[PDB]
Design a protein around this ligand. Structure first.
Ligand SMILES: C[NH+](C)c1cc(NC(=O)CNC(C)(C)C)c(O)c2c1C[C@H]1C[C@H]3[C@H]([NH+](C)C)C(O)=C(C(N)=O)C(=O)[C@@]3(O)C(O)=C1C2=O
Ligand SMILES: C[NH+](C)c1cc(NC(=O)CNC(C)(C)C)c(O)c2c1C[C@H]1C[C@H]3[C@H]([NH+](C)C)C(O)=C(C(N)=O)C(=O)[C@@]3(O)C(O)=C1C2=O
Ligand SMILES: C[NH+](C)c1cc(NC(=O)CNC(C)(C)C)c(O)c2c1C[C@H]1C[C@H]3[C@H]([NH+](C)C)C(O)=C(C(N)=O)C(=O)[C@@]3(O)C(O)=C1C2=O
Ligand SMILES: [Mg+2]
Ligand SMILES: [Mg+2]
Ligand SMILES: [Mg+2]
Ligand SMILES: [Mg+2]
Ligand SMILES: [Mg+2]
Ligand SMILES: [Mg+2]
Ligand SMILES: [Mg+2]
Ligand SMILES: [Mg+2]
Ligand SMILES: [Mg+2]
Ligand SMILES: [Mg+2]
Ligand SMILES: [Mg+2]
Ligand SMILES: [Mg+2]
Ligand SMILES: [Mg+2]
Ligand SMILES: [Mg+2]
Ligand SMILES: [Mg+2]
Ligand SMILES: [Mg+2]
Ligand SMILES: [Mg+2]
Ligand SMILES: [Mg+2]
Ligand SMILES: [Mg+2]
Ligand SMILES: [Mg+2]
Ligand SMILES: [Mg+2]
Ligand SMILES: [Mg+2]
Ligand SMILES: [Mg+2]
Ligand SMILES: [Mg+2]
Ligand SMILES: [Mg+2]
Ligand SMILES: [Mg+2]
Ligand SMILES: [Mg+2]
Ligand SMILES: [Mg+2]
Ligand SMILES: [Mg+2]
Ligand SMILES: [Mg+2]
Ligand SMILES: [Mg+2]
Ligand SMILES: [Mg+2]
Ligand SMILES: [Mg+2]
Ligand SMILES: [Mg+2]
Ligand SMILES: [Mg+2]
Ligand SMILES: [Mg+2]
Ligand SMILES: [Mg+2]
Ligand SMILES: [Mg+2]
Ligand SMILES: [Mg+2]
Ligand SMILES: [Mg+2]
Ligand SMILES: [Mg+2]
Ligand SMILES: [Mg+2]
Ligand SMILES: [Mg+2]
Lengths: 63, 76, 51
RNA sequence: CGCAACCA
RNA sequence: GCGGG
RNA sequence: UGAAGAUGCAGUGUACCCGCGGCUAGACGGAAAGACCCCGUGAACCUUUACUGCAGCUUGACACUGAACUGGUUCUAACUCUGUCCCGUGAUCCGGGACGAGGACCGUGUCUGGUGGGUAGUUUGACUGGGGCGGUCUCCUCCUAAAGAGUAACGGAGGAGUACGAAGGUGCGCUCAGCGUGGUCGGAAAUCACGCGUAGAGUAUAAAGGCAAAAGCGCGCUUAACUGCGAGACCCACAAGUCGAGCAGGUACGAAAGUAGGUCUUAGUGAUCCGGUGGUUCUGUAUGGAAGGGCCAUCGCUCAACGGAU
RNA sequence: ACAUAGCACUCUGCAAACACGAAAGUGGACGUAUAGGGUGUGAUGCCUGCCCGGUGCUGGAAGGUUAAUUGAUGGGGUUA
RNA sequence: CCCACUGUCGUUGAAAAGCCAGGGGAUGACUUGUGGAUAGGGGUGAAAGGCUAAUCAAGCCUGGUGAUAGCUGGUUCUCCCCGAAAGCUAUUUAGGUAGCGCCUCGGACGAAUACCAUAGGGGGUAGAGCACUGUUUCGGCUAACCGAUGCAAACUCCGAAUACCUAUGAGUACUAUCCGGGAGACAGACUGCGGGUGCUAACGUCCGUAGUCAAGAGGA
RNA sequence: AUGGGUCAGCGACUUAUAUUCAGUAGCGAGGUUAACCGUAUAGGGGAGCCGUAGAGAAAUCGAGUCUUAAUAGGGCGUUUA
RNA sequence: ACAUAGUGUUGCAAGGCGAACGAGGGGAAGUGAAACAUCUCAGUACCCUUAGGAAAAGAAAUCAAUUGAGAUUCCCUCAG
């Protein structure tokens, strides 16, 4: 019947005006060894790559 | 069974911008392990000996000095 | 090996840095001057156990 | 050195 | 985490 | 010759058309989607000190479950009897009654520790000159690699899973290794002096590429091994990775121009989930709080089969 | 190969051990340790050595460790 | 009577286990009739995993049920246009799959693109050489050095052709980009050239590069 | 190497519901109703849905917003049927 | 001993079958997770008991949120 959202993916992607945003990996628990540059440049959101956008559209058909 | 099967991933080193090409500031010119090329005018060197353009202009390779060093420089 | 330690700001703010240290060649608690960005000022950070 | 606790 | 050496 | 053993292709030889009795050399003759071998993230049974349950067995707590004298000793009234007698009754079942023997035990329910191939569901990697055995699986350096990049083999060689509050920053200073010649042991080779000195020394560590403005070696002062960022690039399936001038703040060193966002560079590493600690006028299920969650910082994986299936 | 008479070990005191069954109950047995169950060996002759470290089993219980239970303490939240 | 040791035959049988000639037991732990009992993780078993209705490492029937099958097989009329790949990265992954590479359709935008000329570049290969690291022959000298003389994927004082990058230009080509829809494919083969491996073997194997086949008939 | 002795007949990309893209038709900064009522394919039913605004985890703000000490830089947005 | 248990006679009632649907008592596995144990499959198949023309539920010790609605059941939304 109704298409169902993949709820785990709906917690990783948010819809922007022309795409999706997401947080970056490698920023959870092993952080002393990483330089301040990698700490601060892995911080915010980024856009989902256009090669993943099709599968993200098939996984979250309502965002 | 022998003891040789290892190697490392490629590093993609080398000249990225050749002589005569136009660059903008921040463009990478040379990826090198040591300094087989040295920074001339309007060229900076990164911590891993990367030569990059600090200004717009055209790239020019030379041999200069009494040590016969290869130099990259950017003409503005 | 080298143990992980916090360097906590002695300014009241909860700011800290993390580093490693050799516990045998450096048993005393490390004290070093660093920039606290919550008060925007260099203060002294003292060693504390990683949490 | 043993007994017991183990669901990133 | 509880005792022994 | 050819998908590699031809009635059918090429060349060539032979052979009028058609039966019957024999025969089994071929038609890779018929028969049975090969049992051997391998594969499938099939299956079934079986095993065990594989994992995880459960039955059963067992431990204690509470309940049924009480009274005295002091953990016992005694009692009887709960309860038990697959003991005797009576009745229902024409009855070795069962029930009631009487007695006898036990007896607050045993036994049963709920909770709980142990045991538990008895039974159950499952798991038990891949690569591979078949598979197994052995070896390997992630990262760094060189060669193969065909003068941009990239480039395989169970091809040829080696390293890593760290170290360091100085071995980082800065200002100032310095220049080896080897030879000769002399000089207390002391000597081919220690330290001293003098002459050369072709880079052959050194570099925390493997190799390569570097290294005189030394990137090598010392001394003084120090914390830029900073916070917010970041034009623009390189490399890239993605996820990641790399370099970065400049700008703001706060610094260190320097008289000053300046130089510093760790270390000559390239190895020294692990996603997500779940959770911990610090901070936080973000949230707070009627409301005010709180719990809990979010955000920023950080911690916990030989998840080494190193994109990690539980 | 199996069984076998014979042998040995071991369990079992009778509402027996053990088995079947969800329980009631039934077998064992209308038997009672010269009996009944399990295990191995296998007429008979001559015999059957050493090892208790491992895994079982049996006995012991001084100490350590340890469940449910119980709930002393301490810490937080709310607000008169 | 019960059984089934040997052999021949039979093997689309007379027969889904027999006949025939011989064989064993034949008062016993015997054979046998009638009736009854034990039922599927169960029964029964002088134990072969034997037997339980020609079915047994878990019976048969029905139902769950159209179980699931990354595996085989099959997939039905016509014409026209274009037209691949057998690669990389990852994967309990290797005969599966996913992103990218390669195809097609629609839209946008049009020389941005390609070929060639010229110009500007950086190489460390072929060859060469011995300046370094190794290795090597002879001779001189008191081992180092010197003269002569060879060799090298992991040697270099040197060093092409090609290839690659950028700019400018003539001519010739619906070129190149970008945004969407749909894919297939990820077993490749041979030949030449440059190599690793092997025996400077293999219609061997593994790479790079071009062509062909794959998916291409015709002539030799 | 596989499958087919032969013929005839039967025999394999469906249906529902969502959703995305393309075509086409209506209406158009708007479009459209669902159950349901209804001699009933009409008509009524506006509840809802999509579009018209984004930024931020969120509170919040809004052609901007987030990050920040910064009104600097940067991210995502801002004509868009 | 009283009585009760038991026994008998009479009276009325019930039992069985049959489509689905209801309510209740029990309750899988194949499968999916590209393995599998939590989870899914699914309170489904199936077994059992028992109704009615329907059953069940039902008249707030309910929701809501700045002080509203007003038993139960079913349909569309909210909303994947
Ligand atoms: C042009 N050459 C002849 C030259 C000239 C001068 N002189 C000057 O410029 C100043 N004095 C002059 C102008 C001559 C009067 C020179 O000063 C030098 C040199 C040569 C270099 C060579 C260097 C070389 N490396 C380090 C690049 C080298 O390897 C050697 C060597 N012997 O192996 C050198 O000697 C070198 O280091 C060196 O010293 C040079 C000069 O000093
Ligand atoms: C250390 N510097 C100051 C130096 C000095 C001298 N000469 C002296 O010391 C003079 N000797 C005295 C004391 C005056 C008698 C030197 O002679 C040298 C050098 C430098 C080296 C550098 C070498 C370098 N690589 C191999 C490490 C290199 O690649 C080059 C290059 N041009 O590319 C060289 O020139 C180098 O090989 C070389 O020759 C050096 C010297 O000769
Ligand atoms: C020309 N260059 C390449 C050169 C070559 C050699 N030759 C060798 O070392 C040869 N050695 C072999 C055998 C090849 C290994 C040389 O030997 C030299 C030099 C450089 C000169 C320069 C001299 C110079 N003059 C002006 C006195 C000078 O002033 C300096 C300086 N300021 O540093 C020098 O270094 C100089 O004196 C010098 O030493 C040179 C050489 O020795
Ligand atoms: Mg965090
Ligand atoms: Mg050099
Ligand atoms: Mg014939
Ligand atoms: Mg014959
Ligand atoms: Mg024949
Ligand atoms: Mg055959
Ligand atoms: Mg087969
Ligand atoms: Mg098992
Ligand atoms: Mg299963
Ligand atoms: Mg394998
Ligand atoms: Mg290359
Ligand atoms: Mg090349
Ligand atoms: Mg020199
Ligand atoms: Mg997990
Ligand atoms: Mg509240
Ligand atoms: Mg919090
Ligand atoms: Mg793996
Ligand atoms: Mg892996
Ligand atoms: Mg025996
Ligand atoms: Mg004997
Ligand atoms: Mg006979
Ligand atoms: Mg006889
Ligand atoms: Mg069965
Ligand atoms: Mg049974
Ligand atoms: Mg057997
Ligand atoms: Mg079975
Ligand atoms: Mg089927
Ligand atoms: Mg064509
Ligand atoms: Mg087009
Ligand atoms: Mg050569
Ligand atoms: Mg593949
Ligand atoms: Mg392949
Ligand atoms: Mg190939
Ligand atoms: Mg071949
Ligand atoms: Mg093909
Ligand atoms: Mg042809
Ligand atoms: Mg031809
Ligand atoms: Mg065949
Ligand atoms: Mg056939
Ligand atoms: Mg037909
Ligand atoms: Mg299951
Ligand atoms: Mg599965
Ligand atoms: Mg599966």
């Amino acid at each position: 019947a109704k298409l169902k959202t993949r709820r785990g993916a709906a917690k990783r992607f948010k819809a922007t005006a022309n795409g999706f945003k997401r947080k970056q990996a490698f920023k959870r628990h092993i952080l002393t060894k990483k330089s301040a540059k990698r700490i601060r440049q892995l911080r915010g959101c980024v856009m989902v790559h256009v090669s993943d956008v099709a599968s993200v559209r098939r996984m979250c058909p309502y965002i | 069974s022998t003891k040789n099967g290892r190697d490392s991933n490629p590093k993609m080193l080398g000249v990225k911008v050749y002589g005569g090409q136009t660059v903008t500031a921040g463009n990478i010119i040379v990826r090198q392990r040591g300094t087989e090329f040295h920074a001339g005018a309007n060229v900076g060197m990164g911590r891993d000996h990367t030569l990059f353009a600090t200004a717009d202009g055209v790239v020019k390779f030379e041999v200069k000095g009494q040590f016969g060093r290869r130099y990259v420089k950017v003409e503005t | 090996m080298r143990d992980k330690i916090r360097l906590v700001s002695s300014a009241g703010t909860g700011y800290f840095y993390t580093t490693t240290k050799n516990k045998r060649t450096m048993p005393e608690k490390m004290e070093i001057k660093k920039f606290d960005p919550k008060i925007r000022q260099h203060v002294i950070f003292k060693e504390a156990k990683i949490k």
